[PDB]
Design a protein around this ligand. Sequence first.
Ligand SMILES: [Zn+2]
Lengths: 7, 208
Amino acid sequence: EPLPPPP
Amino acid sequence: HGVLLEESGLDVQTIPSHDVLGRIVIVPETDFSFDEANETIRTLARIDRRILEQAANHHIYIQLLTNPITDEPIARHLRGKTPRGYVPGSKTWDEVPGIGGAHLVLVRLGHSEKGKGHGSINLELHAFAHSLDYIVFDHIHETDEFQALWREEAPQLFPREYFFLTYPEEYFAESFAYYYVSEKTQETLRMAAPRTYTFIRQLAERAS
Ligand SMILES: [Zn+2]
């Protein structure tokens, strides 16, 4: 699943 | 395309666990910065070797890039789209310097520290923790144990930060980074969220 870093 | 660290010219024998990281890390085929690559790899080398070895067993790779992550075939489909958990209109994946959760982690060199296109204390540890969570530990953020730690202690370490208070998988990845970035941040995690500290610490024992 594509998981981003915190904004 | 990329080159495996063990197949590159970079010297890494003084880096802890360089034999396993040599099979995990992929560095660019084109001129990059040796300092930025060395600092990123040595940070990953702080991870307990049992965890790194489990990542290699599950065929997880960490590719370091000198370009946006969406230039790579694996993430091309994310071009123009808002990342999960972000407010619409505030960001696209093309602007995100790191991504984890699958078998290929992407980390753009020079964007490790907080504010460099992201809000994590360490981009490579956060992104890699996503793949460990989903692949090595079979979505361990979903366990009843971790759900309890997240509800109780996420407000203690990230107060009024909707991102960590809404997505337990994001609380896992950033707590992992706090544990491994430095003696200071690990102590911060231990002080504000002692159960979460203990959980991350026990991962090395789960990986063996
Ligand atoms: Zn994340």
